[PDB]
């Protein structure tokens, strides 16, 4: 019961890694070098760049999770792997939001989406989500430090002793920074992009229903599957993360709410399983990319 709950993130995150490497490398080769650079394929390429470097930095995390939150790798490598996975997750979610808003502009107001939507504007604007992911990697770059335990353990979570000196003084900035981490995690990482994906795909589904272009079930199935893959994966993780953010004081001072601590690994692996399914769900549904894949290989 408890042991299979502990081992299930490793089981589904291994196949997340194995399918993610294949899918991301294939969608970064066939839509990176073989196809001509339009706007839709450059958004697919940049989500492939957000997702392939995510899947590349994943064996370090599965080794850390499998050992028991023990980090064998070096001091600088822990900070590097965590800033890379945080940049990649914020980039991946912001590019899911940007793809959804791009398709919203393409379907609702296609006059602007033909006139002003060009590949140069894609080049200029697509750096924006990455700069925002860099600024959102702020808590991770300088606060995260590998902690040495005299028992012999190597936990790499946080360290405030350098910043605030005495524990009593730095406890206030710790409980401030972690709840600010939770708020700026949720409000911009899930509250904004899931709402954008929801209202944008609702508006394009209402548009294609009002026009009556849906003669087959395929647009409704794919449009439903994107929202039922982005909501069934990130919301079990984000709800646990935000209940942990609010119940941080009870965990740090009283140490009572231990349900959130054990439940973060299956929900985190389920949130990574969206990244496992993003290349197929976004790019492989298109028949042009399928024909380009068969022509290439």
């Amino acid at each position: 019961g408890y042991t299979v709950l502990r081992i299930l993130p490793l089981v589904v995150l291994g196949v997340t890694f194995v399918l993610g490497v294949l899918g991301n490398g294939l969608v970064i080769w066939v839509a990176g070098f073989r196809m001509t650079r339009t706007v839709t394929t450059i958004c697919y390429l940049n989500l492939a760049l957000a997702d392939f470097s995510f899947t590349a930095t994943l064996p370090f995390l599965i080794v850390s999770m499998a050992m028991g939150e023990k980090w064998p790798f070096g001091w600088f490598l822990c900070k590097l792997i965590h800033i890379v996975v945080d940049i990649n997750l914020f980039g991946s979610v912001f590019l899911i939001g940007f793809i959804a808003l791009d398709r919203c502009i393409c379907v609702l107001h296609p006059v602007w989406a033909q006139n002003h939507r060009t590949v140069s504007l894609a080049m200029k604007v697509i750096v924006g989500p990455w700069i925002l992911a860099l600024v959102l990697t702020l808590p991770v770059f300088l606060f995260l430090t590998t902690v040495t335990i005299p028992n012999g353990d190597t936990y790499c979570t946080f360290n405030f002793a350098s910043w605030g000196g005495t524990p009593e003084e730095r406890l206030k900035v710790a409980i401030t920074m972690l709840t600010a981490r939770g708020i700026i995690r949720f409000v911009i990482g899930f509250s904004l992009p899931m709402s954008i994906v929801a209202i944008c795909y609702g508006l394009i589904a209402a548009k294609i229903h009002k026009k009556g272009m849906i003669k087959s079930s395929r647009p409704l199935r794919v449009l439903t599957a994107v929202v039922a893959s982005f909501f069934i994966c990130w919301f079990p993780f984000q709800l646990v993360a935000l209940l942990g953010t609010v119940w941080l004081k009870e965990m740090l001072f009283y140490g009572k709410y231990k349900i959130i601590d054990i439940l973060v690994n299956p929900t985190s692996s389920l949130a990574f399983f969206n990244s496992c399914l993003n290349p197929m769900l976004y790019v492989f549904v298109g028949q042009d990319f399928r024909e380009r894949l068969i022509h290439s290989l």
Partner: peptide, 6 residues
């Protein structure tokens, strides 16, 4: 407490 990715 356990570190959370995000």
């Amino acid at each position: 407490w356990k570190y959370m990715v995000x």
